[PDB]
């Protein structure tokens, strides 16, 4: 997250760190949202590579013991069937991970609340992106979980020529674009949390930013629109 501030430890208890085994250790690669005790919602693109993956819940600082972490292997990966790695702009950038064990819920580990199907936010709706992604374009991952205030940019604006044009689809949510604050590499798969009727809900799964850079004016961060996938999510969980 570029232009973020450090999240308080218990602000976003559904945020998870998706990690892969790298030698004797593990490397953070993507965010995710805990949606059942044994299911995580992430981006399809985060799991294109044939890697060994684990999920960390109750994580705050990637580089030190928080005393709150639980570590769980990924048992099964279900990518949306229409996802195409050669075409992120087509959408469908969403995947569900079934965990090998059910995690224990507490102040640091909670299920993310999802919006009702079909919900579209009015332009400029207040949201926060969270993640351990790069803190600058071509920079380094954060150590501590970061948050950035990123108001939505509706489909009509976001898909206009000076923004993202045809690249953005109605199955996506755009947020930010101020040239200062944005998602960045390593935030992919994580939540966009938006405040509606007094409650934060996870309206987005972080999907992409501009090839030109993370915080680029009029290139808001783009998210898979969770409310477009409610039936698909339920169908997968019910059949697995
Ligand atoms: Ca830690």
Short mmCIF file of C-alpha atoms and ligand atoms in Angstrom, two decimals:
data_model
loop_
_atom_site.label_atom_id
_atom_site.label_comp_id
_atom_site.label_asym_id
_atom_site.label_seq_id
_atom_site.Cartn_x
_atom_site.Cartn_y
_atom_site.Cartn_z
CA UNK A 1 0.00 0.00 0.00
CA UNK A 2 1.46 3.32 -1.10
CA UNK A 3 0.60 6.36 1.08
CA UNK A 4 -0.85 4.21 3.85
CA UNK A 5 -0.74 4.43 7.62
CA UNK A 6 -0.12 1.56 10.03
CA UNK A 7 -3.36 -0.27 10.80
CA UNK A 8 -4.26 -0.83 14.43
CA UNK A 9 -3.82 -4.56 15.34
CA UNK A 10 -7.56 -5.28 15.63
CA UNK A 11 -9.02 -3.06 12.91
CA UNK A 12 -9.17 -5.62 10.10
CA UNK A 13 -9.26 -9.13 11.67
CA UNK A 14 -10.37 -10.76 8.38
CA UNK A 15 -7.14 -9.73 6.57
CA UNK A 16 -4.83 -12.69 6.00
CA UNK A 17 -1.32 -13.02 4.56
CA UNK A 18 -0.96 -15.58 1.73
CA UNK A 19 2.59 -16.94 1.70
CA UNK A 20 4.61 -19.43 -0.29
CA UNK A 21 7.46 -21.68 0.77
CA UNK A 22 10.80 -20.25 -0.36
CA UNK A 23 13.78 -22.37 0.71
CA UNK A 24 13.74 -22.93 4.48
CA UNK A 25 11.22 -20.12 4.94
CA UNK A 26 8.00 -18.49 3.72
CA UNK A 27 7.47 -15.33 1.72
CA UNK A 28 4.40 -13.12 1.71
CA UNK A 29 2.95 -12.84 -1.82
CA UNK A 30 -0.71 -11.72 -1.51
CA UNK A 31 -3.51 -10.72 0.80
CA UNK A 32 -6.80 -12.51 1.35
CA UNK A 33 -10.01 -12.26 3.35
CA UNK A 34 -11.01 -14.94 5.83
CA UNK A 35 -14.64 -15.70 4.94
CA UNK A 36 -15.22 -19.00 6.78
CA UNK A 37 -13.18 -20.57 9.56
CA UNK A 38 -11.70 -22.81 6.84
CA UNK A 39 -12.07 -20.64 3.70
CA UNK A 40 -10.14 -17.64 2.36
CA UNK A 41 -11.15 -15.44 -0.55
CA UNK A 42 -8.21 -14.16 -2.60
CA UNK A 43 -7.33 -13.18 -6.21
CA UNK A 44 -7.06 -15.92 -8.85
CA UNK A 45 -3.77 -14.43 -10.09
CA UNK A 46 -2.21 -14.95 -6.67
CA UNK A 47 -2.42 -18.70 -7.18
CA UNK A 48 -1.48 -19.13 -10.88
CA UNK A 49 2.01 -20.30 -9.83
CA UNK A 50 2.44 -23.95 -8.83
CA UNK A 51 3.70 -23.07 -5.32
CA UNK A 52 3.23 -24.39 -1.80
CA UNK A 53 0.93 -21.94 -0.03
CA UNK A 54 0.04 -21.23 3.59
CA UNK A 55 -2.29 -18.71 5.15
CA UNK A 56 -1.44 -16.63 8.23
CA UNK A 57 -4.35 -15.20 10.22
CA UNK A 58 -3.97 -12.84 13.15
CA UNK A 59 -0.86 -11.46 11.45
CA UNK A 60 0.26 -7.82 11.96
CA UNK A 61 4.03 -7.56 11.49
CA UNK A 62 5.49 -9.98 8.90
CA UNK A 63 8.95 -9.63 10.43
CA UNK A 64 8.24 -10.24 14.13
CA UNK A 65 6.26 -12.35 16.58
CA UNK A 66 2.91 -10.71 17.33
CA UNK A 67 1.75 -13.45 19.71
CA UNK A 68 -1.51 -13.69 17.75
CA UNK A 69 -0.67 -15.57 14.52
CA UNK A 70 -2.14 -18.90 13.41
CA UNK A 71 -0.49 -20.70 10.46
CA UNK A 72 -2.50 -23.06 8.27
CA UNK A 73 -1.79 -24.96 5.07
CA UNK A 74 -3.92 -24.50 1.95
CA UNK A 75 -5.71 -27.77 1.28
CA UNK A 76 -7.63 -26.96 -1.92
CA UNK A 77 -7.64 -24.10 -4.42
CA UNK A 78 -10.75 -23.24 -6.42
CA UNK A 79 -10.12 -20.56 -9.04
CA UNK A 80 -13.12 -19.04 -10.81
CA UNK A 81 -13.59 -21.19 -13.97
CA UNK A 82 -13.62 -18.18 -16.32
CA UNK A 83 -10.31 -16.79 -15.06
CA UNK A 84 -7.60 -16.36 -17.69
CA UNK A 85 -4.07 -15.45 -16.57
CA UNK A 86 -3.32 -13.84 -19.98
CA UNK A 87 -6.26 -11.43 -19.47
CA UNK A 88 -6.69 -9.84 -16.00
CA UNK A 89 -8.74 -7.13 -17.70
CA UNK A 90 -11.41 -9.77 -18.48
CA UNK A 91 -12.18 -10.05 -14.74
CA UNK A 92 -12.94 -13.25 -12.77
CA UNK A 93 -9.84 -12.55 -10.67
CA UNK A 94 -11.04 -14.44 -7.62
CA UNK A 95 -10.22 -17.75 -5.94
CA UNK A 96 -11.25 -19.56 -2.80
CA UNK A 97 -8.80 -21.47 -0.64
CA UNK A 98 -9.97 -24.23 1.68
CA UNK A 99 -7.67 -24.36 4.72
CA UNK A 100 -6.32 -27.67 6.12
CA UNK A 101 -7.65 -26.76 9.58
CA UNK A 102 -10.36 -24.37 10.83
CA UNK A 103 -8.82 -21.30 12.46
CA UNK A 104 -9.87 -20.04 15.90
CA UNK A 105 -11.73 -16.74 16.00
CA UNK A 106 -10.83 -13.89 18.39
CA UNK A 107 -10.15 -10.08 18.34
CA UNK A 108 -7.46 -10.66 15.71
CA UNK A 109 -9.19 -13.31 13.60
CA UNK A 110 -12.73 -12.76 12.34
CA UNK A 111 -14.80 -13.57 9.25
CA UNK A 112 -15.02 -10.77 6.69
CA UNK A 113 -18.55 -9.54 6.13
CA UNK A 114 -19.50 -9.58 2.42
CA UNK A 115 -21.99 -7.25 0.71
CA UNK A 116 -25.36 -8.47 -0.47
CA UNK A 117 -25.30 -9.65 -4.13
CA UNK A 118 -25.64 -6.88 -6.71
CA UNK A 119 -24.63 -4.04 -4.37
CA UNK A 120 -22.89 -1.21 -6.23
CA UNK A 121 -21.43 1.69 -4.21
CA UNK A 122 -22.22 5.32 -5.15
CA UNK A 123 -19.23 7.23 -6.58
CA UNK A 124 -16.80 8.45 -3.93
CA UNK A 125 -17.91 5.95 -1.25
CA UNK A 126 -15.49 5.73 1.70
CA UNK A 127 -13.27 2.62 1.69
CA UNK A 128 -9.90 1.42 3.00
CA UNK A 129 -7.48 -0.88 1.20
CA UNK A 130 -5.29 -2.94 3.57
CA UNK A 131 -2.18 -5.03 2.94
CA UNK A 132 1.53 -5.62 3.30
CA UNK A 133 2.19 -4.71 -0.34
CA UNK A 134 4.95 -2.40 -1.63
CA UNK A 135 4.98 0.98 0.07
CA UNK A 136 6.27 2.63 -3.09
CA UNK A 137 6.22 1.73 -6.79
CA UNK A 138 9.20 -0.63 -7.27
CA UNK A 139 9.67 -0.49 -3.47
CA UNK A 140 9.55 -3.11 -0.72
CA UNK A 141 6.78 -4.86 1.20
CA UNK A 142 5.58 -3.31 4.45
CA UNK A 143 6.51 -4.96 7.73
CA UNK A 144 3.35 -3.81 9.49
CA UNK A 145 -0.16 -4.03 8.00
CA UNK A 146 -0.99 -0.78 6.18
CA UNK A 147 -4.29 0.91 5.36
CA UNK A 148 -5.08 3.67 2.89
CA UNK A 149 -8.26 5.65 2.49
CA UNK A 150 -9.40 5.03 -1.11
CA UNK A 151 -12.86 6.39 -2.07
CA UNK A 152 -14.56 4.49 -4.88
CA UNK A 153 -14.61 5.70 -8.49
CA UNK A 154 -17.81 4.51 -10.17
CA UNK A 155 -17.95 2.49 -13.39
CA UNK A 156 -18.92 5.42 -15.61
CA UNK A 157 -15.89 7.48 -14.46
CA UNK A 158 -13.46 4.57 -14.10
CA UNK A 159 -14.16 3.23 -17.58
CA UNK A 160 -13.83 6.68 -19.20
CA UNK A 161 -10.84 7.26 -21.53
CA UNK A 162 -8.68 9.29 -19.10
CA UNK A 163 -9.07 6.58 -16.46
CA UNK A 164 -9.05 2.90 -17.34
CA UNK A 165 -11.24 2.84 -20.47
CA UNK A 166 -12.37 -0.61 -21.70
CA UNK A 167 -9.95 -2.26 -19.26
CA UNK A 168 -12.40 -1.89 -16.35
CA UNK A 169 -15.56 -4.02 -16.33
CA UNK A 170 -18.72 -3.67 -14.29
CA UNK A 171 -17.64 -6.79 -12.37
CA UNK A 172 -14.92 -4.65 -10.81
CA UNK A 173 -14.67 -1.84 -8.24
CA UNK A 174 -12.24 1.04 -8.75
CA UNK A 175 -10.97 3.02 -5.75
CA UNK A 176 -8.47 5.82 -5.25
CA UNK A 177 -6.56 7.23 -8.21
CA UNK A 178 -5.35 10.36 -6.38
CA UNK A 179 -1.67 9.79 -7.34
CA UNK A 180 -0.64 9.50 -3.65
CA UNK A 181 -2.36 6.46 -2.12
CA UNK A 182 -2.96 3.08 -3.82
CA UNK A 183 -2.61 -0.66 -3.71
CA UNK A 184 0.75 -1.99 -4.89
CA UNK A 185 2.35 -5.38 -5.56
CA UNK A 186 1.75 -7.76 -2.65
CA UNK A 187 -1.67 -6.27 -1.79
CA UNK A 188 -3.33 -8.40 -4.51
CA UNK A 189 -6.03 -10.74 -3.22
CA UNK A 190 -6.64 -8.62 -0.13
CA UNK A 191 -9.78 -6.70 0.89
CA UNK A 192 -11.23 -3.33 0.01
CA UNK A 193 -13.32 -2.55 3.13
CA UNK A 194 -16.16 -0.05 2.64
CA UNK A 195 -18.38 1.50 5.29
CA UNK A 196 -22.10 1.11 4.49
CA UNK A 197 -24.97 1.60 7.00
CA UNK A 198 -22.45 1.78 9.82
CA UNK A 199 -20.70 -1.53 9.08
CA UNK A 200 -17.54 -2.23 7.07
CA UNK A 201 -17.98 -4.92 4.40
CA UNK A 202 -15.43 -6.37 2.02
CA UNK A 203 -16.53 -4.97 -1.36
CA UNK A 204 -13.31 -5.70 -3.29
CA UNK A 205 -10.57 -8.26 -3.84
CA UNK A 206 -7.43 -6.33 -4.91
CA UNK A 207 -6.69 -7.22 -8.57
CA UNK A 208 -4.45 -4.77 -10.45
CA UNK A 209 -2.84 -1.39 -10.78
CA UNK A 210 -1.30 0.35 -13.80
CA UNK A 211 1.83 -1.07 -15.44
CA UNK A 212 3.14 2.51 -15.13
CA UNK A 213 3.09 2.39 -11.35
CA UNK A 214 0.99 1.87 -8.24
CA UNK A 215 -0.02 5.42 -7.29
CA UNK A 216 -0.79 6.93 -10.68
CA UNK A 217 -3.31 9.77 -10.94
CA UNK A 218 -6.50 8.58 -12.71
CA UNK A 219 -5.40 4.95 -12.48
CA UNK A 220 -7.24 3.90 -9.36
CA UNK A 221 -6.53 0.51 -7.89
CA UNK A 222 -8.87 -2.07 -9.38
CA UNK A 223 -10.64 -4.78 -7.40
CA UNK A 224 -12.82 -7.73 -8.26
CA UNK A 225 -16.36 -6.71 -7.18
CA UNK A 226 -17.26 -9.18 -4.43
CA UNK A 227 -21.02 -8.48 -4.74
CA UNK A 228 -20.88 -9.91 -8.31
CA UNK A 229 -19.70 -13.28 -7.01
CA UNK A 230 -21.92 -14.03 -4.02
CA UNK A 231 -23.65 -17.02 -5.69
CA UNK A 232 -20.37 -18.39 -7.05
CA UNK A 233 -18.76 -18.13 -3.57
CA UNK A 234 -21.72 -19.89 -1.91
CA UNK A 235 -21.80 -22.60 -4.59
CA UNK A 236 -18.12 -23.42 -4.10
CA UNK A 237 -18.34 -23.53 -0.30
CA UNK A 238 -21.51 -25.69 -0.39
CA UNK A 239 -19.94 -28.22 -2.80
CA UNK A 240 -16.58 -28.48 -1.00
CA1 LIG B 1 4.02 -11.54 12.88
#
